[PDB]
Write a protein that binds this ligand. Sequence first.
Ligand SMILES: O[C@@H]1[C@@H](O)[C@H](O[C@@H]2CO[C@@H](O[C@@H]3CO[C@@H](O[C@@H]4CO[C@@H](O)[C@H](O)[C@H]4O)[C@H](O)[C@H]3O)[C@H](O)[C@H]2O)OC[C@H]1O
Ligand SMILES: *[C@@H]1O[C@H](CO)[C@@H](O)[C@H](O)[C@H]1NC(C)=O
Ligand SMILES: [Co+2]
Ligand SMILES: [Co+2]
Length: 434
Amino acid sequence: QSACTLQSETHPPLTWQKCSSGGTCTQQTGSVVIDANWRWTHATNSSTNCYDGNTWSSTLCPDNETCAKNCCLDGAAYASTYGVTTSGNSLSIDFVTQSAQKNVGARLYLMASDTTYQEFTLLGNEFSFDVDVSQLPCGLNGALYFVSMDADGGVSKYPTNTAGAKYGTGYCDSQCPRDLKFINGQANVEGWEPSSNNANTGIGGHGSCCSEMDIWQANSISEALTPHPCTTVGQEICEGDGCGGTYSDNRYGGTCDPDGCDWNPYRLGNTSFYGPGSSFTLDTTKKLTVVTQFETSGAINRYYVQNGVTFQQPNAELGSYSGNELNDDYCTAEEAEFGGSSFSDKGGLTQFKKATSGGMVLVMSLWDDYYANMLWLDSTYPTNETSSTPGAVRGSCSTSSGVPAQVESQSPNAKVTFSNIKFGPIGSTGNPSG
Ligand SMILES: O[C@@H]1[C@@H](O)[C@H](O[C@@H]2CO[C@@H](O[C@@H]3CO[C@@H](O[C@@H]4CO[C@@H](O)[C@H](O)[C@H]4O)[C@H](O)[C@H]3O)[C@H](O)[C@H]2O)OC[C@H]1O
Ligand SMILES: *[C@@H]1O[C@H](CO)[C@@H](O)[C@H](O)[C@H]1NC(C)=O
Ligand SMILES: [Co+2]
Ligand SMILES: [Co+2]
């Protein structure tokens, strides 16, 4: 796609801290950009929609190539249309925003400059952030994570994409998503099937795969830490049901692991750790600090801080695994006790280390789940299972929760706030900010 300028593109600014082994941190000035799927897509020469509701213009977009030539992405009114605001080191994303139309959530990338994404090399380093999840009920997900995106959002590889990172192009994740309207500088119109339950979305013949590090998938009831390996580390197109993942008929068909080696303290038996009010170890009505460390073994370690008190990832016992570090033993024992071979099939933490050793883009998103109502995160999944199936219960939310239409109508003012991002060598981020 090209880019148009009927509405101007000003990325909301956002600062964060780069910290050093020597114990100081210094401020970095970045900004955030909304993914292309949320944008208006129209004819380069007019205001005629290339994409409308959940279908494409059959004349403008008779095929992927022609569509991409005819069509541009335009600017975003971040606050008024998308409910996205920043203030210093603080980002907020509202759930439902009402302008001329209704908007649901946002997916945002951190920018290095107006035209390029910021890449972080995770291995050997740690990432710290503050989050307020108090306004996030069952069925919602305020997500902070990393994906192996190209810093330019695909421009150098596919010159028919001239919009780039500036317009939030290039997305890929471990689901090989097929809901994307542009992949590899072409439209996804060929094979498009509009969604049965979502007025604004559909599923194309192509998807976009890549490694994904889910630092934080969470609401006020449940939270999960999840690495997802792919046989191809970086962004790569996939064809139809070969994509695998959520958007395909067959989940395990493809090149990515869409399940991941997930760590959810509730799922692992400690139901007292994380939730709303004073009866939990971490009170989700208040802001909390989340620190995630990527040791060079490829294992992942985690601690939390709330009102000056530090808590490690809680100990979990699972088969012959015991401890709080997400390592090969945990992941192998998880597959053994909970089932599945997708993580080990795609190479485990070894394959995943190849992504953390390379550059990854920071994503911050707020979403509801039109596919499984977020039950896999905060409820019992599949829903026919009981507490007697190992790993079935992942939170305290009803199996009736998170119908998108319901939660959008009842909880339009839901929102997430991420703040005080700090990145550097392991051990460094608890030092005073610059
Ligand atoms: O000036 C007018 C333009 O502002 C208007 O632009 C519309 C802005 O909203 C666009 O709809 C977006 C599409 O993305 C939805 O998010 C989905 C969430 O789930 C994800 O899996 C999926 O990938 C996302 O697409 C978002 O909620 C929704 O608001 C709409 O298409 C634009 O056209 O166009 C008319 C102009 O006059
Ligand atoms: C859950 O984890 C916290 C933090 O490690 C711990 O203090 C608490 O005792 C755990 N709860 C249970 C019921 O074991
Ligand atoms: Co193709
Ligand atoms: Co270790």
